[PDB]
From a paper:
Beta(β)-lactamases are bacterial enzymes that provide multi-drug resistance to β-lactam antibiotics. Mtb β-lactamase (BlaC) is a broad-spectrum Ambler class A3 β-lactamase capable of hydrolyzing all classes of β-lactam antibiotics used for the treatment of tuberculosis. Sulbactam (SUB), clavulanate and tazobactam, all β-lactam based suicide inhibitors, irreversibly bind to β-lactamases and block their activity. Here, we report in atomic detail (between 2.2 and 2.7 Å resolution) by room-temperature, time-resolved crystallography with millisecond time-resolution (with timepoints between 3 ms and 700 ms) how the Mycobacterium tuberculosis enzyme BlaC is inhibited by sulbactam (SUB).
Due to its smaller size, SUB should diffuse faster into the crystals than CEF, and the signature of an enzyme inhibitor complex is expected to appear at the earliest time points (3 ms and 6 ms). Nevertheless, contrary to expectations based on the size of the SUB, no electron density is present at the earliest time points. This can be explained by the smaller second-order binding coefficient, kncov (1.5 mM−1 s−1 for SUB compared to 3.2 mM−1 s−1 for CEF), which prevents the accumulation of electron density at earlier times. At 3, 6, and 15 ms, the DED features near the active site of subunit A are weak. At 6 and 15 ms, density features appear closer toward Ser70. These results could indicate an initial trace of SUB molecules migrating to the active site after being held up by the guardian residues. The guardian residues open the active site after approximately 6 ms, which corresponds to the outside ligand concentration of approximately 35 mM.
Residue numbers in the entry:
A (entry chain C), B (entry chain B), C (entry chain A), D (entry chain D): 29 to 293
Write the structure that this text describes.
């Protein structure tokens, strides 16, 4: 059936594929390696922003945060420009979602506080919505470099999809803060060739990508059918065995998204 | 296999759906009511141009054709504007494909000459390409309103797909004339909500639409995978039971195109 | 001076140009041969529909009208298809506006009744909105062939623009009937290369074209600025020197429309 | 008389507008603050690509360039995705023009070599084409935030228009290399709401945008009339008085482009 093409796509792209689509009232749940651990990568920035939103008032977005030149460690296209000006929490939220700003993510983790620079506070927030599997242990860019098989900084397509469903479609945030998260994901600039490229243009797509070593390429997304029916699509992939320097294949994520669209149509 | 979704689409739209995709080297052929007769409607204008292209040298496209106001007996968005100046054979080809100009099609049939105002000459050209099923018996706009069950002005998704394959992908025309047909189909303006709306934007789509009474809506097309693999997609549909004035449902054709796209990925 | 470009366009196209744009609160009125008589041609079909709407209830649109093949005298892409079934008043309104159906216009004129097949009743309707200049004396297609200098079947850009302003922007019709006129004019299919081709795509354009002998080409339209400010643009032209068979030049109307857009910007 | 509308637009938008259109054989040059200095912003990426093309054979476009995470110090929608794989010189040209990739621009400046990371080499190339005014002193993103009144990283509408004319319309590049520059500018994705939005759709538009702080918004472009006559349109604007955080107003550039189109018609 459909689980055979996923294995076919795995051969043609030499990767390990993970797909989960939560079941709705009208459709059944799509699963393929759904409960196998994949690396969070940049996709954790999606619940991270929601974590800052959940515990703090809206005025917290206007707090100005200053940082130094030693604080930049990974790709940070926005943090590099404001070393003298500083950035507000809201600007750090925009950078972490739409541009995958690594340094902005580290500062938002620090805003959560606690041990591990906010990693313990973040996974603790992950447990509050019922995710007892995911875990964040390092910061950027260390979380992208974990060896295969290591359980640190990992989630699963099943686990990450249900969190995103509660955050965008559920009641994990008041409408209030919920529309801020959704709007940042709608104007994302880093995922044009992934799940968005696999769905027809008349489908609305909001997403948050993830990319790391060992050919790791992820994309969590919420799509809307042309009639307005929403779905949650979690697509993760790595190429463990091809080495640390294995190139990630975005086409595999886009090809799998077309397979999912064929079923939901 | 895929034929369960197609039947689950016929009930939702109160229509009869026909789908055929010729098999390539790596994939099998998709069929659903593939050998059932559907009305040609305006889709015959695509091989009609190929018949005029095939029978004449390239310089024949510069021949000026004159017509009167009585020749405008159907929707003719381009021929209606040049009644005083006349239009060349090449302009008649452009209008019949990109705008589905009914009057332009009738003049091109006259250019083929012969009995039935060129209908016998057109069906003969279809027989030369191996099409032993299709038949054109009337002109515009009579060909659209044949009663259900009548075999006049009908083809089948199997027959029309194999005809289109020889014209675009095969060698039924020399390269110079073949590129003229493909470009006219690429710049079509009437199929934005059919097969084009069912495939992702990174797939190239050239098509020719057809629409008539009894909720008739067809779309023949050639699609190109993002890597460059070509496919032929014939989608035809009617709702004859709903009556002469039944609206055609373009969403059904776009939804079926998304189901097919999921398989070709 | 904008009136120099209009005379420059007249020299470059070998034509006589007429332009009138009613003055709004913020802009001055554009005039060029504004009070010179030009042939109505198909542009009279816009106030003709308003005449049937104004004098008759909405239920009158469902009345079925029967006609014979001898009643088809002018370009009639829709009346030719429904000669056996007949057409309702509402369909005759649709045909007369979106496709410039000549036969549908004659049948709508007959619906106004009176002497001259409804021409005297129609000009009487023009007098009710304050237009003491325009006059319709013949039917289709005779009104398109009046010799130059003849005052029959003529209007002026000044007169026709102020009439159109009352019908779309004014209170000449109640809201329920006004929306029917605007919707047919918005989905017009015969004016894509005239006023529409001269304004940028972010401007909304509704129009009704006219074309006749002696190189007659007209276009009356209501445009909306990207911010929502409405304007009325009347553009008419003929080439009463190139002879009876002189080709009309659509580019002249489109070029003049870009000149007007430059002033309203 | 066009400079009065430009002055009204400056008051309407709280901005300073600069417009220059080089004179052709039949038309005179349009000027408004044509010799006043405006900030280059991203518009320098167009002649920068031409400088790299000019100094190297076509095979140099295949040279692979590698970079680190610190090379991403600005918005780089393409360079952020290929930091692991590296990008050839040709992709850097595509990214710097079609996506305004800041990091791709910095790498191309480095390919020119010399003092100042290639800025001195770039300004030298402008002097070879006769540009005695422009000057590039910094890299991205420092060049976008020079204080008002500072002459660094500035050009003029007069100077930038003549440079673009030599590169697209002149002989500053051989035909094989000229078509590469022209094709990249035709497929631009960042200028849909500027000069392109001010010209009618039947005009061909290739452009390169620029945006920075102090409300800086630029668009240099080459437009083609529907008959095929080309024009060069340089439109620059800033709102320095409103401060560093002043919003740029794209509508002003699109509105001014509509004023120019009315004159060139």
């Amino acid at each position: 059936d459909l689980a055979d093409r996923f294995a076919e796509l795995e051969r043609r792209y030499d990767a390990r594929l993970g797909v989960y689509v939560p079941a709705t009232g009208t459709t059944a749940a799509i699963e393929y390696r759904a409960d196998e651990r994949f690396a969070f990568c940049s996709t954790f920035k999606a619940p991270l922003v929601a974590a800052v939103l959940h515990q703090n008032p809206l005025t917290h977005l206007d707090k100005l945060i200053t940082y130094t030149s030693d604080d930049i460690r990974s790709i940070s296209p926005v943090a590099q420009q404001h070393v003298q000006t500083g950035m507000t929490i809201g600007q750090l939220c925009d950078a972490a979602i739409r541009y995958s700003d690594g340094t902005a993510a580290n500062l938002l983790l620090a805003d959560l506080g606690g041990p591990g620079g906010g990693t313990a506070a973040f996974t603790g927030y992950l447990r509050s919505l019922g995710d007892t599997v995911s875990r964040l242990d390092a910061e950027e860019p260390e979380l992208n470099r974990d060896p295969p098989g290591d359980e640190r900084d990992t989630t699963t397509p099943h686990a990450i999809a249900l969190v995103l469903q509660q955050l965008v479609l559920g009641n994990a945030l008041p409408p209030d803060k919920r529309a801020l998260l959704t709007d940042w994901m709608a104007r994302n600039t880093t995922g044009a060739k992934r799940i968005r490229a696999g769905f027809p243009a008349d489908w609305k797509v909001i997403d948050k990508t993830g990319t790391g070593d060992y050919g790791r390429a992820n994309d969590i997304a919420v799509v809307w059918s042309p009639t307005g029916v929403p779905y949650v699509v979690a697509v993760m992939s790595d190429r463990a065995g091809g080495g640390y320097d294995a190139e990630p294949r975005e086409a595999l994520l886009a090809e799998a998204a077309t397979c999912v669209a064929g079923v939901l149509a």
